[PDB]
Enzyme design. Structure first.
Site, mmCIF file in Angstrom:
data_model
loop_
_atom_site.group_PDB
_atom_site.id
_atom_site.type_symbol
_atom_site.label_atom_id
_atom_site.label_comp_id
_atom_site.label_asym_id
_atom_site.label_seq_id
_atom_site.Cartn_x
_atom_site.Cartn_y
_atom_site.Cartn_z
ATOM 1 N N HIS A 99 0.801 -1.236 0.000
ATOM 2 C CA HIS A 99 0.000 0.000 0.000
ATOM 3 C C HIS A 99 0.850 1.312 0.000
ATOM 4 O O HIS A 99 0.972 2.021 0.986
ATOM 5 C CB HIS A 99 -1.042 -0.051 1.076
ATOM 6 N N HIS A 156 1.447 1.468 -5.961
ATOM 7 C CA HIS A 156 0.121 0.835 -6.108
ATOM 8 C C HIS A 156 -0.940 1.879 -6.566
ATOM 9 O O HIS A 156 -1.747 1.598 -7.475
ATOM 10 C CB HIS A 156 -0.312 0.190 -4.782
ATOM 11 N N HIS A 214 -6.893 6.900 -3.623
ATOM 12 C CA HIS A 214 -7.815 5.990 -3.009
ATOM 13 C C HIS A 214 -7.255 5.223 -1.831
ATOM 14 O O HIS A 214 -8.047 4.731 -1.089
ATOM 15 C CB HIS A 214 -8.399 5.006 -4.031
ATOM 16 N N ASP A 215 -5.916 5.094 -1.677
ATOM 17 C CA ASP A 215 -5.321 4.434 -0.482
ATOM 18 C C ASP A 215 -4.430 5.399 0.332
ATOM 19 O O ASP A 215 -3.492 4.975 0.996
ATOM 20 C CB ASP A 215 -4.471 3.205 -0.924
ATOM 21 N N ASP A 217 -8.573 -1.499 -8.701
ATOM 22 C CA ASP A 217 -7.947 -1.786 -7.401
ATOM 23 C C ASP A 217 -7.528 -3.256 -7.232
ATOM 24 O O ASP A 217 -6.644 -3.544 -6.433
ATOM 25 C CB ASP A 217 -8.924 -1.375 -6.253
HETATM 26 C C1 32V Z 1 -8.760 -10.413 1.045
HETATM 27 C C2 32V Z 1 -7.803 -10.555 0.245
HETATM 28 C C3 32V Z 1 -6.638 -10.789 -0.690
HETATM 29 C C4 32V Z 1 -5.968 -12.007 -0.840
HETATM 30 S S1 32V Z 1 -4.714 -11.920 -1.983
HETATM 31 C C5 32V Z 1 -5.095 -10.245 -2.338
HETATM 32 C C6 32V Z 1 -4.458 -9.375 -3.268
HETATM 33 O O1 32V Z 1 -3.427 -9.752 -4.063
HETATM 34 N N1 32V Z 1 -4.859 -8.072 -3.333
HETATM 35 C C7 32V Z 1 -4.245 -7.119 -4.273
HETATM 36 C C8 32V Z 1 -5.069 -7.088 -5.525
HETATM 37 C C9 32V Z 1 -5.951 -7.647 -2.522
HETATM 38 N N2 32V Z 1 -6.375 -6.282 -2.630
HETATM 39 C C10 32V Z 1 -7.404 -5.820 -1.679
HETATM 40 C C11 32V Z 1 -6.761 -5.256 -0.449
HETATM 41 C C12 32V Z 1 -7.908 -4.452 0.126
HETATM 42 C C13 32V Z 1 -8.642 -3.904 -1.052
HETATM 43 C C14 32V Z 1 -8.218 -4.701 -2.260
HETATM 44 N N3 32V Z 1 -6.595 -8.491 -1.606
HETATM 45 C C15 32V Z 1 -6.126 -9.807 -1.511
HETATM 46 MG MG MG Z 2 -7.842 0.506 -0.056
HETATM 47 ZN ZN ZN Z 3 -5.930 0.009 -3.269
#
Ligand code: 32V
Ligand code: MG
Ligand code: ZN
Length: 318
Positions: free
Chosen positions: A74, A78, A114-115, A224
């Site tokens: 984050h 990103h 957004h983050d 995202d």
């Molecule tokens: C729950 C879960 C996850 C397991 S692997 C993974 C990942 O590679 N990302 C990057 C795409 C995100 N992004 C999320 C983080 C919070 C908002 C979007 N969430 C997860």
């Molecule tokens: Mg976020």
């Molecule tokens: Zn994000």
């Protein structure tokens, strides 16, 4: 060479295989400012809104610098990635044919911010440690409300839109908030079910602002979590970084007897398994509905990469 090649890569900023990592190394960490500036000028926004270029650079730098670069995932790279994806989606025909310069401006600002000021740990963590943000936002979309109010603070502080009416500034704040709040992944079921029902009914009217902004919210949600829809070589870097951040939160939870969150335990959890579940249950459902809305080469390419990347992770099992 370094300014040479940077400038050069921006000729291909509409490309799905754009390499934001190289771009950020090329600019000594200036990828979000330099990409977003380029997009404002490419979409004609500096002229359309009579923007002071000095104030725009200041604004973009305040944003970039309020990301925590020590976060493995984050951070401003990103943000810059999400903004670059949003740009590819804004070029899809159904969006390119209905969005106004005002929509483009709010989409790219929302993507960039957004983050903003993300602490590198998630909402359940801030809630169980009684963090002041969880209080301030009553345990609901705590981080997204924080990114949004931080973005509002930078908008006001920069004066970038000071020559527009107050009511337009307020509306900008409110529509950016609705875009950023849509990125609360814990509520994807509410956004995806509403979007899917609109697609079943066929009732979306893109010349209506409300319907168009619902779609922009779904586009930002795609931007995202489109890491697994990139080429393997990008997606693998994003997966190691996100896992690295989750696992660090895990080590703190373990060290301090906080309870280890799902997905944060490096001892019982695997990079490949984490990606696979995420792709099956969050990525593929959102991108399948997205491809119903915008049924294009780009949507097919993105779903092809999810299937290929998911097979690669299975491959690295046994
Ligand atoms: C729950 C879960 C996850 C397991 S692997 C993974 C990942 O590679 N990302 C990057 C795409 C995100 N992004 C999320 C983080 C919070 C908002 C979007 N969430 C997860
Ligand atoms: Mg976020
Ligand atoms: Zn994000």
């Amino acid at each position: 060479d370094y300014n040479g090649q940077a400038k050069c890569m921006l000729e291909k900023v509409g490309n799905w295989n754009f390499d934001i990592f190289l771009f950020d190394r090329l600019t000594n960490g200036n990828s979000l400012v330099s990409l977003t500036f380029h997009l404002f000028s490419l979409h004609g926004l500096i002229e359309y809104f009579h923007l002071d270029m000095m104030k725009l650079r200041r604004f973009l730098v305040m944003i970039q610098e309020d990301y925590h670069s020590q976060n493995p995932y984050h951070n401003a790279v990103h943000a810059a990635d999400v903004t670059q994806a949003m740009h590819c989606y804004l070029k899809e025909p159904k969006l390119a044919n209905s969005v106004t310069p005002w929509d483009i401006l709010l989409s790219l600002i929302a993507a960039a911010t957004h983050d903003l000021d993300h602490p590198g740990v998630n909402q359940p963590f801030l809630i169980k440690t009684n963090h002041y943000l969880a209080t301030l936002y009553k345990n609901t979309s705590v981080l997204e409300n924080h990114h949004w109010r931080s973005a509002v603070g930078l908008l006001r502080e920069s004066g970038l839109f000071s020559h527009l009416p107050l009511e337009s500034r307020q509306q900008m704040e409110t529509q950016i908030g609705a875009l950023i709040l849509a990125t609360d992944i814990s509520r994807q079921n509410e956004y995806l079910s509403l979007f899917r029902s609109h697609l079943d009914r066929g009732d979306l009217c893109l010349e209506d602002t409300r319907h168009r902004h619902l779609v922009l919210q779904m586009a930002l949600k795609c931007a995202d979590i489109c890491n697994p829809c990139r080429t393997w070589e990008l997606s693998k870097q994003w997966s190691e970084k996100v896992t690295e951040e989750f696992f660090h939160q895990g080590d703190i939870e373990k060290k301090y007897h906080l309870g280890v969150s799902p997905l944060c335990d490096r001892h019982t959890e695997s990079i490949a398994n984490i990606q696979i579940g995420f792709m099956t249950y969050l990525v593929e459902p959102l991108f399948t509905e997205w491809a119903r809305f915008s049924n294009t080469r780009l949507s097919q390419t993105m779903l092809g990469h999810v299937g290929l990347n998911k097979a690669s992770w299975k491959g690295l099992q046994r």
